[PDB]
Amino acid sequence: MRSIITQICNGVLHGQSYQSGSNDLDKGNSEIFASSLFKDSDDKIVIGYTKDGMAFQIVVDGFYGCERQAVFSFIDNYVLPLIDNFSLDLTRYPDSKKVTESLIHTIYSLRSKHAPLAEFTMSLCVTYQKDEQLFCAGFGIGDTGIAIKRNEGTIEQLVCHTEVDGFKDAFDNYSSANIDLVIERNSVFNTKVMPGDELVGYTYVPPMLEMTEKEFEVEIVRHLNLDPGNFDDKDPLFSQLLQVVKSKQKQLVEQAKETGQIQRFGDDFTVGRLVIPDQLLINQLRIHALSIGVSDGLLSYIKNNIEKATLYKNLIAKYQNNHFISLIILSALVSDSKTPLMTQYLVGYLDFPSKALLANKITELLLKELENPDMREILGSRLATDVIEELETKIIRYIDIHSTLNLWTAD
C-alpha cells in the first residue's frame, strides 16, 4: 500500500542507449545509464527512497533473454516491499550480518515458490539512520558491483564482483542448496556515509578496467574492485566512468578489426548512480511518501463525501512538487471533523493505530522545514506557530487561493 521508487530501467532500452528521467523528487541525484556492449537489455536497475525516506539502489543482471520478465515482476511485486523491512532491521537490530543472510534466505525461499525459473545476479545497498550519522548496508552476489566516492576524492569500493574460479555465484537453483557457502565468498557490507558521497552501481565492464582485490579459497575465489588509478577526484564518478569505457570501446573494437571477421564478447552494460541525501531532503522525501499513499486508497472504495478528495487529489497533484504546501494541505484533512470517514479511513489504509500519532508526525516535519533556508526567506519574523493555524483555516474554504498560495511557492 505505497509508492516509493523514483527511477527504473525495465526490460527495455532505446537504440544503442537509454539514459534517465532525472526525477525532480531526487533534485538531480537519481541517474542511471544503459547500453549494449557487443540489441536488447536484460539487466534492471532500481533507485528509490523508503517511506521513512531512506535511500537505496538495486542492480540486477539476468541470464536468459527468454524469461526476462518474471525476473522483473519478481522484484516489483515481492522484493521491493522487503527494502523497508531491511532498513528498519538495520535501524532496530545492530548486527548487520544476521538480517542480511535472512533477507537472502527470504529471497531464496521466495524465489523458489514464486518464480524458480528466474536466474540473475543482484546487488543492492540501502541507507539507514540509527544515530545522528547515516549508515548504508547491503550485499551483492554475482557479476554485479557497487562503488562509492567520498567527499575527499576517494573511490572506495563497496560490494565487489565475486568470481568463483571462473564461476559466477548467482541466484540460481543450482546454488539454492549451497546457500551458506555463497555468503562467505560474496560481499556484504555496512559502512558509514556522509552527505554528498557518490554511490555508483554497475553491471558489466571490460576486464581491462577491473583490478583484483582479494583472492582466497574454500573447501579459488576472486574478489575484484574497479581500478581507481584512471579516475580523478574533481569530476563525479558516473560521468567519468562513461568517459573511459567508450574511450576503451573504440580501442577494443579497433582491436577487433585485425582478427579476420567478427569476434564475440560483451555483456549488457547498465549503470546506476545514487547520491546520499541530506537531512533536509529526507524530510521532504518523507513528505512525498505520505502524499502519494494518501490519495489512491479512498478512490476505489467509493468507486464501488467524495467530491472534496477528488479535488484534493488534483490539488496535491498541482502542488506536490513544492514540499511545504503539500504538507500543510494534509493538516487540514485531519482537522475536518465534518469529514470523519475520509479522515478515519486513511489511517486504516496506512495501518496507523491512532489518528493523533499521525497528527504529531505532521507538525514535526512541518517545523523542521522552517530550518530549510528557503522558508526563512519566505517566513520572516512572522510567528509561524500561528500562521500554520491560520493556514489551516485558509484551506477549509472548499468553494481563489492559488494566487494567495503562490506567495509561498515564489522560488
Residue numbers in the entry: 37 to 74, 88 to 268, 279 to 363, 383 to 477, 484 to 495
What does the publication say?
Crystals that diffracted to 3.6 Å were obtained with a slightly truncated variant comprised of residues 37–507 (SidD37-507). Residues 85–88, 269–276, 365–382 and 495–507 were not well-defined in the electron density map and could not be modeled. The six SidD37-507 molecules present in the asymmetric unit displayed identical structures with an L-like shape formed by two domains in nearly perpendicular orientation. The N-terminal deAMPylase domain possesses a protein phosphatase fold, while the CTD is formed by a bundle of anti-parallel alpha-helices with no apparent similarity to known structures. The two domains are connected via a flexible linker and are positioned almost perpendicular to each other in the crystal lattice. The ab initio molecular envelope calculated from the SAXS data revealed a similar L-shaped structure but with a maximum diameter Dmax of 115 Å, which differed from the calculated value of 89.2 Å for the crystal structure. Indeed, the SidD37-507 crystallographic structure exhibited a low fit with the observed solution scattering curve (χ2 = 2.48) supporting the hypothesis of interdomain flexibility. Our SAXS analyses subsequently revealed a relative mobility between the two domains, with 76% of the particles existing as L-shaped molecules in solution while the other 24% of the particles assumed a more extended morphology. Upon closer examination of the CTD sequence, we noticed a stretch of hydrophobic residues between helices α7 and α8 (370-FLGIYGFFT-378; loopCTD) that was unstructured in the crystal structure of SidD37-507, indicative of intrinsic flexibility, and that could constitute a potential membrane anchor for SidD. Having a high degree of flexibility between the catalytic domain and the localization domain could increase the sampling radius of membrane bound SidD from a two-dimensional plane to a three-dimensional space.
While SidM catalyzes the attachment of adenosine monophosphate (AMP) to Rab1, SidD catalyzes AMP removal from Rab1, a process known as deAMPylation. Inactivation and removal of Rab1 is initiated upon translocation of the effector SidD which deAMPylates Rab1, thereby priming it for inactivation by the L. pneumophila GAP LepB and causing its gradual removal from the LCV 4–6 hours after bacterial uptake. SidD is a protein of 507 amino acids with no significant sequence homology to other entries in the database. Taken together, our data revealed that the CTD mediates localization of SidD to membranes using a dual-binding mode that combines a general membrane-binding determinant in form of the loopCTD with a specificity determinant represented by a helix-turn-helix unit at the C-terminus.
